[PDB]
């Protein structure tokens with residue numbers, strides 16, 4: 015059966031405060047692993063039809079040595095998105111996150127999101143992760159990851 | 170094998186600030202799907218014995234155009250409950266959530282909860298979701314949902 | 325197939341404000357169950373090779389009758405750790421949590437963490453849970469738990 | 480067959496399990512229901528057919544909960560919020576009792592797990608504080624202080640005594 | 644074969660499904676594509692081969708969203724942030740419109756789902772407030788008040804009139 | 808057999824893998840352990856039998872961490888909190904160093920990844936600030952200012968000089 019557990023590529027995490035689609039994950043390193051699925055720049059492609067369980071864990075962190083978080087409005091979010099190489103538009107499968115106040119006097123701020131779902135996937139369909147504040151992403155392999163594993167067949 | 174992925178029925182979300190058991194979900198629409206299980210007014214009924222994995226994702230949101238959140242005490246919670254058509258009393262399987270301060274000056278507040286567990290279910294037993302503040306529920310199909318899928322047999 | 329769903333041993337929750345590895349769970353009581361896996365003082369030992377799905381739900385709570393939370397710096401965390409009876413050092417598989425401000429005037433504060441992942445486990449390897457503030461742990465069986473179930477074989 | 484203490488399965492009529500016991504294995508064509516007693520800290524309160532017993536709720540002191548009775552193998556453990564707090568079904572927690580404003584007093588006797596009931600101060604009584612425990616206290620008798628009643632009191636304030 | 648309205652599968656050339664219909668079952672060696680219409684509240688806007696139809700987005704009033712058009716079975720529902728708010732792609736929410744500082748006015752006409760554009764006050768006009776709606780208002784004409792222009796106004800303040 | 812560099816499996820005695828290599832496939836009845844070198848950024852520090860190599864920890868600058876040494880394929884990468892911060896095992900983060908109150912100074916030399924040690928100010932020295940870096944500074948010598956020592960200083964304050 016096919017599966018995937020992709021941890022964040024710590025050396026290729028985008029910068030800025032705008033929402034982006036993450037385009038770099040590990041696939042064969044540490045806890046990162048992939049089988050009978052293909053990965054191309056943050057797009058985990060399904061090679062075999064079936065019902066998969068999709069999950070994602072996203073950790074945001076900020077230390078005071080990096081400066082200060084501006085605008086005061088802070089909404090740390092994660093969207094698990096299903097794209098396709100036949101239809102241009104993409105669609106959210108799962109959504110998670112929280113508005114936060116990180117304007118305190120503490121030296122470190124941390125927050126993690128977790129999402130999980132049972133979805134019907136066809137070959138050719140692709141799963142991708144997009145986050146709100148990539149500059150706040152935790153590069154740790156136990157912190158920021160997303161994955162999938164087949165449970166049943168479609169028939 | 171049996172499974173279910175129920176997204177919130179956006180047109181039938183209860184009002185008020187009291188904890189209620191959600192009694193309306195989608196079962197065959199968008200990402201919503203059900204197989205070899207029955208759904209009757211928010212009660213996902215098990216038709217086949219086995220060990221299932223239960224999960225729920227609940228999103229709470231509030232915009233300032235809706236007014237203001239009173240009482241100041243705000244505890245956004247989710248309880249995954251197992252009822253039964255043979256015993257009146259119901260019991261919590263999983264619990265999640267957080268106390269929140271949404272009295273800020275921001276125009277939008279958001280928070281999501283996620284729970285997951287491996288449980289032994291018998292035919293006739295029913296799973297239901299109850300939330301603390303139904304008037305704050307996110308109607309999106311990627312936001313508010315709960316599901317189940319059989320992994321192993323009981324034997 | 326092997327599995328485990330361990331709820332917190334409510335009568336043996338450690339005290340203090342230092343991070344500890346939880347060494348007492350229920351294994352055959354209420355929703356707590358275990359099969360083809362062994363549990364020894366908070367170390368869920370794998371007896372059979374395979375790809376497992378690991379999950380943990382941790383709830384933190386505090387009521388005002390217990391006093392007040394000092395230091396003001398509060399980071400509620402959970403680490404799912406893989407140890408081994410062949411190598412002394414342990415390694416984090418999954419990480420979750422949030423920095424919190426529980427210095428408000430409310431009588432009750434609550435927060436839950438959830439983590440989930442698909443991992444490759446060998447016989448002899450052990451999974452354990454460690455939390456940051458054990459004195460804030462929710463003793464409820466639906467609140468604080470961790471588990472595992474085999475999905476596929478390694479081959 | 481009989482609705483109470485009995486259940487039908489595979490055509491034949493089997494007997495349910497008494498409170499304190501769970502249904503280990505249901506009726507076979509060659510035997511009746513096998514019922515084993517509930518384990519430690521477990522319970523079943525009705526005539527059931529459950530695979531396993533329910534686990535007693537934890538009266539967490541960290542939630543300001545205390546046990547009224549621990550319950551048996553046939554009985555649910557019952558919890559209550561400690562002094563000054565009442566159970567709230569919406570949050571499933573022990574919320575702080577409602578304070579009674581000046582002019583109002585907390586009705587006695589104070590209930591165990593219920594919220595404070597506020598009653599207006601009657602004639603000759605007053606309350607000058609916000610309290611969920613303090614009831615309407617009587618006006619000070621100026622004679623006891625060796626003084627005289629200068630100005631009469633209200634429901635929010637005491638009388639004033641002068642040494643005239 | 645043909646790139647539009649057609650797709651190749653198992654060698655043979657099959658026809659796609661028209662907008663409003665989904666691909667129930669793909670082409671067999673003995674039949675073409677079977678296309679069924681989209682269910683309630685569902686839609687498909689292109690010539691597709693999808694297993695099921697897409698569900699219309701929810702124009703949540705709780706997110707300050709409102710529907711411009713509900714959309715058909717061949718059309719996506721389109722939402723917009725209500726008055727005073729603009730859609731932000733980063734947070735996917737209706738953010739509060741930018742206020743224009745004194746000396747600047749909100750350009751009109753105000754757009755539906757877009758943020759306020761701030762334009763400096765021209766000669767003879769002023770703005771003395773922070774507002775995302777209020778534009779540059781003209782100086783007061785002292786003649787209308789039966790007075791005279793004492794001191795000329797600026798872009799941040801009005802003129803002052805004296806009854807001299 | 809031998810406890811070090813060897814392990815028993817299927818009766819026979821096999822040899823472990825040297826640091827820098829992982830156990831690709833364990834011993835068969837017709838061959839010994841097959842050991843392949845650790846991949847990029849991976850490592851193993853002991854004589855092992857692991858299926859795969861461990862991934863080096865990330866010295867995240869966003870956590871105020873910096874690498875002392877990057878480590879090899881046989882060596883763990885070692886991190887330290889940057890200047891002014893010490894590692895805390897409970898939160899697994901770089902916590903702010905403890906400030907030394909007036910009357911106390913930060914002991915030198917300052918450690919790399921350790922918290923500030925506070926030492927009382929000795930005779931002739933003082934500290935008038937809260938600082939995790941500043942140590943006890945000596946009293947001002949009034950002669951250098953062409954003045955005289957009016958009042959002697961303490962551990963919290965400097966001496967005062969008068970031009971008398």
Ligand SMILES: *[C@@H]1O[C@H](CO)[C@@H](O)[C@H](O)[C@H]1NC(C)=O
Pocket residue numbers: 548550551553554555
């Ligand atoms: C506990 O068991 C005793 C046995 O006599 C019974 O009388 C009592 O009612 C039980 N407690 C409760 C709360 O039912």
Ligand SMILES: *[C@@H]1O[C@H](CO)[C@@H](O)[C@H](O)[C@H]1NC(C)=O
Pocket residue numbers: 712714715717718719
């Ligand atoms: C809805 O359907 C009608 C059918 O005539 C079509 O004209 C219209 O363009 C559709 N709406 C949208 C937004 O495409």
Ligand SMILES: *[C@@H]1O[C@H](CO)[C@@H](O)[C@H](O)[C@H]1NC(C)=O
Pocket residue numbers: 876878879881882883
């Ligand atoms: C890295 O490898 C070299 C090889 O000579 C070794 O000397 C050194 O000790 C290793 N580094 C560490 C931290 O062990």
Ligand SMILES: [Cl-]
Pocket residue numbers: 039040041042043046
């Ligand atoms: Cl890789």
Ligand SMILES: [Cl-]
Pocket residue numbers: 132133134135199200201202
């Ligand atoms: Cl789906």
Ligand SMILES: [Cl-]
Pocket residue numbers: 194195196197198201
């Ligand atoms: Cl439906």
Ligand SMILES: [Cl-]
Pocket residue numbers: 287288289290354355356357
């Ligand atoms: Cl169970």
Ligand SMILES: [Cl-]
Pocket residue numbers: 349350351352353356
């Ligand atoms: Cl147990």
Ligand SMILES: [Cl-]
Pocket residue numbers: 044045046047442443444445
């Ligand atoms: Cl793994």
Ligand code: NA
Pocket residue numbers: 579580581582583584585606607608609610
């Ligand atoms: Na009162």
Ligand code: NA
Pocket residue numbers: 743744745746747748749770771772773774
């Ligand atoms: Na203005």
Ligand code: NA
Pocket residue numbers: 907908909910911912913934935936937938
């Ligand atoms: Na000092």
